[PDB]
């Protein structure tokens, strides 16, 4: 029975000169820290136990106390930034990195987990873990011919810790560290375990959330086709990070965007744009908006895949945030599209849901919609059809909205609505 000791008992045992009494009290500490009702992390920290646990990490001749203190320190490090800091301040980083070499899989796994909590605190501790040299021993834990021979929970913990080394910005992780880690991430992106795949996708989405040189580091490894495949997965915990990574990638150059189109991503968007999860619809529409901001032949691929009716559908009925992203998709489309493409977009029914959205209480979406309207009117002048479109906007209640928006707080709103009223409704 090491169940339900007091912190004072734990301190008394850890302070004895008896390694076995210390092992008993460390296991008591661990069981205290792995109950879910409010683990007394701060009392353990305050008792001054962290340096003792960290020294127990180096008792290679008593592997049980290595394990129990590794687990206790893991759970302290799982807490607030101050609690993680207390663990780091006890010298835990190099001791856990040494434990990565342990012959006992449960102990090296626990060192992997602890290092993942430390790195997961943020940029500074992530970079400190990297500077102490964790990446090579971590990656060496995966240097086997076939990932499937590793224990499931083990491989999952390693994948999660690696993704935490890829995570966070300001600054993003060191370029050389990202380059060291990426080949292993690519291998994990082809593993068959859903949880490994989800965490690998999260890591790729972190690496692609930056400037185009970061995106390019990833796209150059040729993972986009695999990301599109995962974009078609049935498991939502996979589709969410695959979609986020794909959308990050299309915020880059038109050639990076083109790699996404080339890999076949557009064929998944009918189901993504009607997906029952609001966040999937929102992120798919955001991705579409950064694709309609591309070249006219890319706008044309959007058209050929039949996606303009889906954008019309999401503009007509969706969560308001999704509708804002659809408004952006439409304004980008109209800004870059040919006149034929803008005409197509009107023929699909864009005007009425665009009008209906002008009555929303969000300034930016109203600016976005008015900009799209102006672009469509300019395509109409190019065809001498401005009267027809004026009639359409008047026929669905739009004119009332633009006129009422003449008297609006925002400067751009009233300026643009007044411009439209004078240029086309007079």
């Amino acid at each position: 029975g090491t169940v339900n000791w007091s912190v004072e008992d734990i301190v008394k045992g850890i302070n004895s000169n008896n390694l076995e009494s210390q092992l008993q009290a460390t296991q008591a500490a661990r069981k205290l820290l792995s109950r879910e009702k409010q683990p007394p992390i701060d009392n353990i920290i305050r008792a001054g136990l962290i340096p003792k646990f960290v020294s127990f990490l180096g008792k290679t001749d008593c592997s049980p106390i290595q394990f129990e203190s590794a687990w206790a320190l893991t759970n302290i490090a799982s807490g607030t930034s101050e609690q993680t800091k207390a663990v780091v301040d006890g010298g835990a980083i190099p001791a856990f990195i040494s434990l990565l070499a342990s012959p006992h899989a449960h102990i090296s796994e626990q060192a992997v987990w602890a290092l993942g909590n430390i790195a997961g605190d943020g940029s500074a501790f992530r970079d400190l873990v990297i500077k102490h040299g964790a990446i090579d021993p971590l990656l060496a834990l995966l240097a086997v011919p076939d990932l499937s021979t590793l224990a499931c929970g083990y491989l999952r913990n390693l994948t999660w810790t690696l993704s935490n080394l890829c995570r966070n910005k300001n600054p993003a992780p060191p370029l050389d560290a990202v380059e060291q880690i990426l080949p292993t991430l690519v291998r994990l992106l082809h593993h068959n375990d859903p949880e490994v795949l989800a965490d690998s996708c999260w890591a790729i989405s972190y690496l692609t959330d930056g400037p185009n040189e970061r995106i390019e580091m990833v796209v150059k490894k040729g993972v986009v086709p695999q990301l599109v495949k995962l974009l078609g997965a049935t498991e939502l915990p996979i589709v969410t990070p695959a979609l986020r990574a794909i959308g990050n990638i299309v915020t880059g150059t038109d050639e990076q965007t083109q790699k996404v189109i080339d890999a076949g991503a557009l064929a998944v968007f009918p189901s993504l744009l009607t997906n029952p999860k609001t966040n999937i619809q929102k992120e798919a529409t955001w991705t579409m908006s950064n694709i309609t901001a591309g070249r006219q032949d890319q706008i044309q691929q959007v058209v050929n895949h039949g996606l303009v009716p889906f954008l019309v559908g999401v503009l007509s009925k969706a969560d308001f945030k999704t509708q804002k992203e659809a408004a952006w998709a439409i304004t980008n489309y109209t800004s870059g599209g040919t006149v034929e493409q803008i005409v197509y977009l009107v023929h699909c029914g864009i005007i009425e849901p665009l009008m209906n959205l002008l009555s929303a209480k969000d300034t930016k979406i109203i600016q976005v919609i008015l900009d799209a309207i102006s672009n469509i009117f300019q395509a109409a002048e190019k065809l001498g059809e401005t009267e027809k479109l004026s009639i359409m906007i008047e026929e669905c209640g739009g004119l009332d909205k633009i006129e009422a928006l003449q008297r609006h707080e925002n400067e751009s709103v009233y300026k643009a609505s007044l411009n439209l009223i004078e240029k086309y409704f007079s």
Partner: peptide, 7 residues
């Protein structure tokens, strides 16, 4: 998800 307690 960024930090994980065991058990």
């Amino acid at each position: 998800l960024p930090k994980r307690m065991r058990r």
